[PDB]
Design a protein around this motif. Structure first.
Motif, PDB file in Angstrom:
ATOM      1  N   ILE A   1     -33.268  95.012  15.488  1.00 57.84           N
ATOM      2  CA  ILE A   1     -34.387  94.607  14.642  1.00 57.84           C
ATOM      3  C   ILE A   1     -35.675  94.861  15.411  1.00 57.84           C
ATOM      4  CG2 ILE A   1     -35.367  92.755  13.252  1.00 57.84           C
ATOM      5  CD1 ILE A   1     -32.564  93.699  12.443  1.00 57.84           C
ATOM      6  N   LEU A   2     -36.633  95.524  14.766  1.00 54.23           N
ATOM      7  CA  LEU A   2     -37.906  95.856  15.399  1.00 54.23           C
ATOM      8  C   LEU A   2     -38.943  94.779  15.102  1.00 54.23           C
ATOM      9  CD1 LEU A   2     -38.165  99.674  14.473  1.00 54.23           C
ATOM     10  CD2 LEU A   2     -36.765  98.561  16.240  1.00 54.23           C
ATOM     11  N   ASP A   3     -39.817  94.506  16.081  1.00 55.50           N
ATOM     12  CA  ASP A   3     -40.865  93.520  15.841  1.00 55.50           C
ATOM     13  C   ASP A   3     -41.783  93.947  14.704  1.00 55.50           C
ATOM     14  OD1 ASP A   3     -42.342  95.559  17.080  1.00 55.50           O
ATOM     15  OD2 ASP A   3     -43.081  94.306  18.712  1.00 55.50           O
ATOM     16  N   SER A   4     -41.910  95.254  14.468  1.00 54.77           N
ATOM     17  CA  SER A   4     -42.812  95.731  13.425  1.00 54.77           C
ATOM     18  C   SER A   4     -42.310  95.367  12.030  1.00 54.77           C
ATOM     19  CB  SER A   4     -43.004  97.241  13.548  1.00 54.77           C
ATOM     20  OG  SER A   4     -41.769  97.913  13.402  1.00 54.77           O
ATOM     21  N   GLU A   5     -40.999  95.433  11.794  1.00 56.27           N
ATOM     22  CA  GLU A   5     -40.526  95.077  10.459  1.00 56.27           C
ATOM     23  C   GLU A   5     -40.595  93.572  10.231  1.00 56.27           C
ATOM     24  OE1 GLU A   5     -36.242  95.921   9.807  1.00 56.27           O
ATOM     25  OE2 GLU A   5     -36.126  96.253  11.969  1.00 56.27           O
ATOM     26  N   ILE A   6     -40.374  92.771  11.278  1.00 56.46           N
ATOM     27  CA  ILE A   6     -40.514  91.323  11.133  1.00 56.46           C
ATOM     28  C   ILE A   6     -41.983  90.940  10.962  1.00 56.46           C
ATOM     29  CG2 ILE A   6     -40.108  89.093  12.255  1.00 56.46           C
ATOM     30  CD1 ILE A   6     -37.614  90.523  11.109  1.00 56.46           C
ATOM     31  N   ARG A   7     -42.894  91.675  11.593  1.00 53.78           N
ATOM     32  CA  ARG A   7     -44.325  91.410  11.428  1.00 53.78           C
ATOM     33  C   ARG A   7     -44.751  91.633   9.984  1.00 53.78           C
ATOM     34  NH1 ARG A   7     -46.375  94.835  14.948  1.00 53.78           N
ATOM     35  NH2 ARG A   7     -46.149  93.175  16.520  1.00 53.78           N
ATOM     36  N   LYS A   8     -44.313  92.762   9.411  1.00 58.90           N
ATOM     37  CA  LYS A   8     -44.589  93.093   8.015  1.00 58.90           C
ATOM     38  C   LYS A   8     -44.052  92.013   7.068  1.00 58.90           C
ATOM     39  CE  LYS A   8     -44.105  97.042   4.836  1.00 58.90           C
ATOM     40  NZ  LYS A   8     -42.720  97.000   4.293  1.00 58.90           N
ATOM     41  N   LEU A   9     -42.889  91.516   7.373  1.00 59.99           N
ATOM     42  CA  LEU A   9     -42.271  90.457   6.583  1.00 59.99           C
ATOM     43  C   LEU A   9     -43.052  89.149   6.679  1.00 59.99           C
ATOM     44  CD1 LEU A   9     -40.012  89.146   4.910  1.00 59.99           C
ATOM     45  CD2 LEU A   9     -38.728  88.836   7.044  1.00 59.99           C
ATOM     46  N   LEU A  10     -43.408  88.751   7.905  1.00 66.78           N
ATOM     47  CA  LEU A  10     -44.137  87.498   8.090  1.00 66.78           C
ATOM     48  C   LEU A  10     -45.509  87.548   7.428  1.00 66.78           C
ATOM     49  CD1 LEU A  10     -43.239  86.384  11.745  1.00 66.78           C
ATOM     50  CD2 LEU A  10     -42.430  85.472   9.553  1.00 66.78           C
ATOM     51  N   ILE A  11     -46.207  88.682   7.545  1.00 69.38           N
ATOM     52  CA  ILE A  11     -47.495  88.832   6.874  1.00 69.38           C
ATOM     53  C   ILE A  11     -47.329  88.647   5.372  1.00 69.38           C
ATOM     54  CG2 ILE A  11     -49.298  90.482   6.275  1.00 69.38           C
ATOM     55  CD1 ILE A  11     -48.981  91.637   9.130  1.00 69.38           C
ATOM     56  N   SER A  12     -46.269  89.231   4.802  1.00 70.36           N
ATOM     57  CA  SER A  12     -46.025  89.085   3.369  1.00 70.36           C
ATOM     58  C   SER A  12     -45.768  87.629   2.996  1.00 70.36           C
ATOM     59  CB  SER A  12     -44.871  89.997   2.939  1.00 70.36           C
ATOM     60  OG  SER A  12     -43.603  89.471   3.305  1.00 70.36           O
ATOM     61  N   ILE A  13     -45.024  86.903   3.831  1.00 74.18           N
ATOM     62  CA  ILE A  13     -44.765  85.493   3.546  1.00 74.18           C
ATOM     63  C   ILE A  13     -46.055  84.684   3.623  1.00 74.18           C
ATOM     64  CG2 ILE A  13     -43.560  83.426   4.363  1.00 74.18           C
ATOM     65  CD1 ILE A  13     -41.376  85.463   5.415  1.00 74.18           C
ATOM     66  N   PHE A  14     -46.910  84.988   4.600  1.00 71.90           N
ATOM     67  CA  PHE A  14     -48.092  84.175   4.840  1.00 71.90           C
ATOM     68  C   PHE A  14     -49.187  84.376   3.802  1.00 71.90           C
ATOM     69  CE2 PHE A  14     -46.391  82.466   8.565  1.00 71.90           C
ATOM     70  CZ  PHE A  14     -47.285  81.574   9.132  1.00 71.90           C
ATOM     71  N   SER A  15     -49.027  85.323   2.872  1.00 75.67           N
ATOM     72  CA  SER A  15     -49.932  85.398   1.723  1.00 75.67           C
ATOM     73  C   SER A  15     -50.047  84.053   1.012  1.00 75.67           C
ATOM     74  CB  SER A  15     -49.456  86.491   0.761  1.00 75.67           C
ATOM     75  OG  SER A  15     -48.433  86.012  -0.099  1.00 75.67           O
ATOM     76  N   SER A  16     -48.951  83.292   0.964  1.00 74.56           N
ATOM     77  CA  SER A  16     -48.985  81.966   0.356  1.00 74.56           C
ATOM     78  C   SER A  16     -49.824  81.005   1.187  1.00 74.56           C
ATOM     79  CB  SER A  16     -47.561  81.428   0.192  1.00 74.56           C
ATOM     80  OG  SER A  16     -46.969  81.879  -1.019  1.00 74.56           O
ATOM     81  N   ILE A  17     -49.789  81.153   2.514  1.00 76.73           N
ATOM     82  CA  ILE A  17     -50.495  80.228   3.393  1.00 76.73           C
ATOM     83  C   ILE A  17     -51.987  80.553   3.441  1.00 76.73           C
ATOM     84  CG2 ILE A  17     -50.712  79.540   5.824  1.00 76.73           C
ATOM     85  CD1 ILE A  17     -47.545  79.829   5.857  1.00 76.73           C
TER      86      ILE A  17
ATOM     87  N   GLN B   1     -34.169  82.509  15.946  1.00 78.30           N
ATOM     88  CA  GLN B   1     -34.345  83.181  17.229  1.00 78.30           C
ATOM     89  C   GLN B   1     -35.150  84.466  17.078  1.00 78.30           C
ATOM     90  OE1 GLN B   1     -33.851  81.026  20.232  1.00 78.30           O
ATOM     91  NE2 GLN B   1     -33.923  83.243  20.571  1.00 78.30           N
ATOM     92  N   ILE B   2     -34.928  85.199  15.992  1.00 81.36           N
ATOM     93  CA  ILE B   2     -35.705  86.398  15.699  1.00 81.36           C
ATOM     94  C   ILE B   2     -37.176  86.038  15.585  1.00 81.36           C
ATOM     95  CG2 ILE B   2     -36.202  88.142  13.934  1.00 81.36           C
ATOM     96  CD1 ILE B   2     -33.175  88.085  13.338  1.00 81.36           C
ATOM     97  N   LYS B   3     -37.439  84.952  14.876  1.00 76.27           N
ATOM     98  CA  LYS B   3     -38.804  84.469  14.676  1.00 76.27           C
ATOM     99  C   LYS B   3     -39.457  84.126  16.012  1.00 76.27           C
ATOM    100  CE  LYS B   3     -39.640  80.300  13.423  1.00 76.27           C
ATOM    101  NZ  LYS B   3     -38.973  79.240  12.611  1.00 76.27           N
ATOM    102  N   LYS B   4     -38.765  83.406  16.817  1.00 74.03           N
ATOM    103  CA  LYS B   4     -39.292  83.001  18.118  1.00 74.03           C
ATOM    104  C   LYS B   4     -39.437  84.172  19.091  1.00 74.03           C
ATOM    105  CE  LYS B   4     -37.126  78.400  17.915  1.00 74.03           C
ATOM    106  NZ  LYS B   4     -36.151  77.535  18.645  1.00 74.03           N
ATOM    107  N   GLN B   5     -38.410  85.019  19.157  1.00 68.84           N
ATOM    108  CA  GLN B   5     -38.355  86.040  20.198  1.00 68.84           C
ATOM    109  C   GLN B   5     -39.270  87.222  19.897  1.00 68.84           C
ATOM    110  OE1 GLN B   5     -34.489  86.647  21.750  1.00 68.84           O
ATOM    111  NE2 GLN B   5     -34.898  88.695  22.571  1.00 68.84           N
ATOM    112  N   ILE B   6     -39.262  87.726  18.661  1.00 71.77           N
ATOM    113  CA  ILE B   6     -40.028  88.918  18.317  1.00 71.77           C
ATOM    114  C   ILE B   6     -40.945  88.721  17.118  1.00 71.77           C
ATOM    115  CG2 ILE B   6     -38.198  90.369  19.283  1.00 71.77           C
ATOM    116  CD1 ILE B   6     -37.659  91.250  16.304  1.00 71.77           C
ATOM    117  N   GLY B   7     -40.927  87.559  16.472  1.00 77.43           N
ATOM    118  CA  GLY B   7     -41.773  87.360  15.306  1.00 77.43           C
ATOM    119  C   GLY B   7     -43.244  87.281  15.686  1.00 77.43           C
ATOM    120  N   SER B   8     -44.089  87.877  14.847  1.00 84.19           N
ATOM    121  CA  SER B   8     -45.526  87.869  15.093  1.00 84.19           C
ATOM    122  C   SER B   8     -46.253  88.141  13.787  1.00 84.19           C
ATOM    123  CB  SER B   8     -45.927  88.907  16.145  1.00 84.19           C
ATOM    124  OG  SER B   8     -45.816  90.217  15.616  1.00 84.19           O
TER     125      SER B   8
END
Ligand SMILES: [Ca+2]
Length: 328
Positions: A239-255, A205-212
């Motif tokens: 949870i702030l969208d900015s910290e989830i954004r930073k996290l997702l960007i870090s994960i997507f280094s693999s992609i 839900q975090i991913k869907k609602q505020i993940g970017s």
């Protein structure tokens, strides 16, 4: 009377099955549950995946497909037979045309085994294609043209990318960093940074609602609940969208490394198509906010999100019915 067409998207977390004249008859987890020591089916799909937490002792859960991997060919046949049983028609396989879409990791041995398995069930013709080829066709790409098609499919348990030209796959690779990994990494990040354990559903839900993946037109935050790490007590945090954004960007280094690997393999004859036409993106995670902008910024090529990313593979199988029937 024409032969019945059956399409199976083996998928990486969910499988999807289509029967001509019936539509999609199955679309959920590739899991099944039996009474212990029996083949008495108690749950299939989502109803079975739920119980993975603490299965009733008189119940055994089987996973024929784990992140797109065939765990056991006999167990995979049981699952395929359960799918066909959804049609509620006697002899659904008899004289049928069967198209199976699978990840590339399914070996040639396993694909040939599934052909013999479906023919033994009664099929007249069984064809196995890779999921990235079908996803591109389903998402609206002309995979039959000699022009280069560049596809990225971010599913539940695998992310795959490939180059397609003239009806076939020129090159393709896959990684294990996909939707399920992302959800689990959100869970792990929130436990480490906010000292609260959330469930998988809250992570999704975090991913869907505020993940970017890219700073959008709205700044969002979110209240979540979970188990306090130290005390175990129910606890609330924001949870702030900015910290989830930073996290997702870090994960997507693999992609982005996967896409770089595929792009580095582009033949000279198709380099112009990569630069001018760019990437097509399908799969469950194609709808992450800012994915287009994030990828366009990094690669400086056009990126297009599929209109039907969650169903691109099976939609391509459905569109591929003509090609099989035509070439016959
Ligand atoms: Ca990383």
């Amino acid at each position: 009377p024409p032969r019945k067409f059956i399409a199976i998207d083996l998928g990486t977390t969910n499988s999807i099955a289509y029967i001509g004249g019936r539509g999609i008859i199955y679309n959920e987890a590739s899991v099944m549950a039996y009474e212990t020591g029996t083949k008495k089916l108690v749950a299939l799909g989502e109803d079975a995946r739920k119980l993975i937490g603490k299965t009733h002792d008189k119940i055994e859960i089987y996973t024929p497909l784990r992140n797109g991997a065939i765990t056991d060919l006999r167990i995979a046949e049981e699952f395929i037979q359960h799918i066909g049983n959804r049609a509620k028609v006697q002899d659904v396989w008899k004289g049928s045309i069967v198209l199976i879409a699978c990840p590339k990791s399914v070996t040639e041995l396993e694909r040939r085994a599934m052909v013999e398995m479906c023919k033994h069930l009664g099929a007249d013709l069984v064809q196995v294609e890779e999921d990235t080829l079908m996803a591109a066709l389903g998402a609206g790409a002309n995979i039959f043209a000699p022009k280069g098609t560049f596809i990225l499919d971010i599913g539940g348990g695998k992310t795959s990318a490939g180059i397609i030209s003239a009806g076939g796959i020129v090159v393709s690779k896959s990684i294990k960093i996909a939707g399920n990994y992302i959800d689990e990494e959100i869970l792990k990040y929130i436990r480490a940074k906010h000292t609260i354990s959330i469930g998988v559903v809250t992570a999704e839900q975090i991913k869907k609602q505020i993940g970017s993946l890219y700073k959008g037109k709205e700044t969002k935050k979110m209240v979540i609940f979970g188990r306090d790490v130290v005390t175990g007590m129910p606890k609330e945090t924001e949870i702030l969208d900015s910290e989830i954004r930073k996290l997702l960007i870090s994960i997507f280094s693999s992609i982005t490394q996967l896409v770089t690997d595929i792009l580095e393999s582009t033949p000279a004859e198709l380099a112009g198509d990569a630069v001018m036409n760019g990437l097509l993106v399908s799969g469950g995670c194609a709808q992450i906010s800012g994915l287009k902008e994030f990828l366009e910024s990094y690669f400086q090529i056009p990126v297009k999100i599929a209109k039907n990313p969650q169903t691109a593979v099976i939609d391509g199988c459905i569109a591929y019915e003509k090609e099989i029937r035509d070439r016959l």
